[PDB]
Amino acid sequence: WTGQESLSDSDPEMWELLQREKDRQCRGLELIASENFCSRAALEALGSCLNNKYSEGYPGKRYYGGAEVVDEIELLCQRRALEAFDLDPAQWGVNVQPYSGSPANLAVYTALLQPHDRIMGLDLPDGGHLTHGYMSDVKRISATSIFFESMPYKLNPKTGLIDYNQLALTARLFRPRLIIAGTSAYARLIDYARMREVCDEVKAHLLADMAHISGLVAAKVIPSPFKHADIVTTTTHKTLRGARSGLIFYRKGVKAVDPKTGREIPYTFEDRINFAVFPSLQGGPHNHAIAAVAVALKQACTPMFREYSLQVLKNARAMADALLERGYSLVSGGTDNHLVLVDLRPKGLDGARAERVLELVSITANKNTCPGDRSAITPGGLRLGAPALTSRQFREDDFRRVVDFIDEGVNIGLEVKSKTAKLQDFKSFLLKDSETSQRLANLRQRVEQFARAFPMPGFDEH
Amino acid sequence: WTGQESLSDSDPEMWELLQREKDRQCRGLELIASENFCSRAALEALGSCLNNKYSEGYPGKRYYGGAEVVDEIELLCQRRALEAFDLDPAQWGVNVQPYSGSPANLAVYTALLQPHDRIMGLDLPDGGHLTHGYMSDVKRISATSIFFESMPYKLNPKTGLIDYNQLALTARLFRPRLIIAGTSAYARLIDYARMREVCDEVKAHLLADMAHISGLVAAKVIPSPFKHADIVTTTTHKTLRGARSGLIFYRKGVKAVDPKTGREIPYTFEDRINFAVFPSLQGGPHNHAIAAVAVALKQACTPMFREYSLQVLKNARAMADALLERGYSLVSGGTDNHLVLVDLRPKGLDGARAERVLELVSITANKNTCPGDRSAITPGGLRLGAPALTSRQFREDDFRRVVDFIDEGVNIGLEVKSKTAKLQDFKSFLLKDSETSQRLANLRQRVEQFARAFPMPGFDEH
């Protein structure tokens, strides 16, 4: 044994599984708004010998040696991160060690809050992320709500927008020290200028969690949260098209000096952010991930990536219009980012039913809940994203053919619901009725045949 | 742009960094006890298109589709995990989603304890891990000590062994809800049975955190904590030789019968552990890491890996013996596992001076605290580990050579100490004194020539 044998040679069972998953990604239409297809170059870094290096601490402030190179890689990732979001290294710093998106948020709270301090985030069913806070009426679900005290701010259920008015009202009473502006399932821009006002008033911290849209921000395709927020957190995947990791951006330097004499009240985020990440929460950095992120961050700095980003927007808008053209309704009234929220209720269908059907013809999205709604089993919509297919060089005509394939899916789904009862029947119906089965099998071929033709980032076979 | 370009073509700055680190790994004598060299087969899974797949949730219990293959992989990783540690699936369950070793522990605490519940672990200067709790006299440093209430137990400084009698005495008073058995810097086997009795008496859960020793446990070359612990966490790197990830093992099935009616008292770990990992703490799994882990786990079941782990024990003991023969002192006098703890105080040089000299001749170790140490800047010891070099097919005689080199570096460090005052004059002198830099360059070149000839797991260039 050398540890240099190939995966296909030494673990064929696993190689088989990787090829299956690579086939599945190539042959399907990928509309889960959070997913993307990562470049071979980033993957090459991800599976590198950097996995072997323990480097607890930070560059030039490690606890043991051998860190000559990983130090330069960590700093390179920092600079590339600041460049990708056009930030002055004098006004902003960045931590690149968070293992994923969720860990990046937990470290922000730990750095800046005391246990049981108050947090406000967009409610889960209103398109928030779990890490922003969630309690059922019987259980604290998100650790954010075990260790801190969260209260959701809510969506105006008529405009599908963030009820900025209530939020200011709800917040002057609840008194959060932290408000989170960012989302999972929201199709419009966030008004960070107003968030910052509600925050400057209740004297809360403004945290932008830009996971879903971070690539749009780097490409300057939509407005930057860094204008208003003191802190920004993000996945490095999703629209950023990186490897799975996380980042924490914080304001550094002098904040203001209007009260105490004239002493430029420095921002105090940097030290607390970095200390919370390590030593408080995490262990050894994942240097292979840090390098892969640095590769993805470099790509995001280029003209090529802005072009990708615009195409993302175009393909979302084109996806919206394509749907509004067959009468579908869009909570929000369309989109202004990488995704569209489709209210399937007016067309007499739900988010759950659509998904199982779409998935069976190699189309993948996620059911989600819509304003109002009811049973969390049968949610009200489908979340649909561009970024993935856009990275396969998809174009508006291509997406319109996607909507057409989707529409034949819903139409199978609408037709399937008339002949069945509950969600258990509606799913067995899909796999059981030889007429609906045979119709699914064919619609699959058309979808697979059409998807395979496009290019796919990454390695060839895995 | 296809995202199919190679790293060396598309990011030469990063490619050059990878090559420098690869050269550093190939030419160094790597003795950091937490390090290993990951197999190419696992690394190929790590840098695969599994990075693209969002699969929030668990096999079959997902929140959206497209998980056909990812479900099989995670289920396969679970099986290989139970099998690597010879665990009855009726008696043991495993969660394979923790992003790393530290997340795995925080998930166990949140699963089983309420905020501010009490935890005891081995004191950090005594060789415990940060995630087991740590507070200075003025600051809560570990997140474990922020969200929970930690109190350490200690070594007997006379024997360098865990003082099980004082743990017992002290747990009866503190009444921990959870006691942690596991170490970062301990050369001896832990008395899990004794810990089990202490936990049974005070009604605490026993958590075995076997991160450092898990490879030895898998190979059955040392006793298994699964015989006595309720919960077992581990890293998947270190002696397991995998990519960086984590595991939580938990007992399941019938715990005991009711003294009165059969009743049946079941274990309640499975649901709480899995719920804490997700939705409470983490986001989407890192499926590329999960697959890489599955690869490392299968390797760990082979006769090859048992042989390797036996050699790790022999090599650590060879290193211990050769250190003793040269007049070094070892904390607790020797070793029964993969590492040895050197006490350099009797030879007149501290672990900080020694680590920096060793680093400049391409021998990487880490300074660490010895029983009765009073300075955090000048700890009196060095932790040395055998696993990384054993994976390069070092044998007992090679470790004897390694000790020869170490001894040379120590002697150099002694001389420089006699010509300098403070720690920072020592480190400067190593770089700026002509005769000293010469001595070091000669030793470094001999170390690197010796090291370069052994094989190296991984890819050829990065």
Swiss-Prot record, chains A, B:
Tell me its cofactors: pyridoxal 5'-phosphate
What else the UniProt entry mentions is: In eukaryotes there are two forms of the enzymes: a cytosolic one and a mitochondrial one.
Q: What is the effect of changing residue 64 to F?
A: Abolishes serine hydroxymethyltransferase activity, leading to oxidative phosphorylation deficiency
Please state how the activity of this protein is regulated. Answer: Hydroxymethyltransferase is inhibited by succinylation at Lys-238.
Organism of origin is Homo sapiens
Q: Provide the GO biological process annotations.
A: formate biosynthetic process; glycine biosynthetic process from serine; glycine metabolic process; L-serine biosynthetic process; L-serine metabolic process; one-carbon metabolic process; positive regulation of cell population proliferation; protein homotetramerization
Which residues are annotated with the PTM Phosphoserine?
A: 428
Checking Gene3D superfamilies in the record gives:
Aspartate Aminotransferase, domain 1 (3.90.1150.10), Type I PLP-dependent aspartate aminotransferase-like (Major domain) (3.40.640.10)
The record's SUPFAM superfamilies line, in alphabetical order, gives: PLP-dependent transferases (SSF53383)
So what EC number does this one have? 2.1.2.1
Task: Tell me a Gene Ontology molecular-function term this record carries.
Answer: chromatin binding
What catalytic reaction does the record list? (6R)-5,10-methylene-5,6,7,8-tetrahydrofolate + glycine + H2O = (6S)-5,6,7,8-tetrahydrofolate + L-serine
Top-level taxonomy: Eukaryota, Metazoa, Chordata, Craniata, Vertebrata
Q: What happens after mutating residue 61 to R/E?
A: Does not affect succinylation level or hydroxymethyltransferase activity
| Listed result of changing residue 56 to L | Abolishes serine hydroxymethyltransferase activity, leading to oxidative phosphorylation deficiency
What name has this protein been given in UniProt? Serine hydroxymethyltransferase, mitochondrial
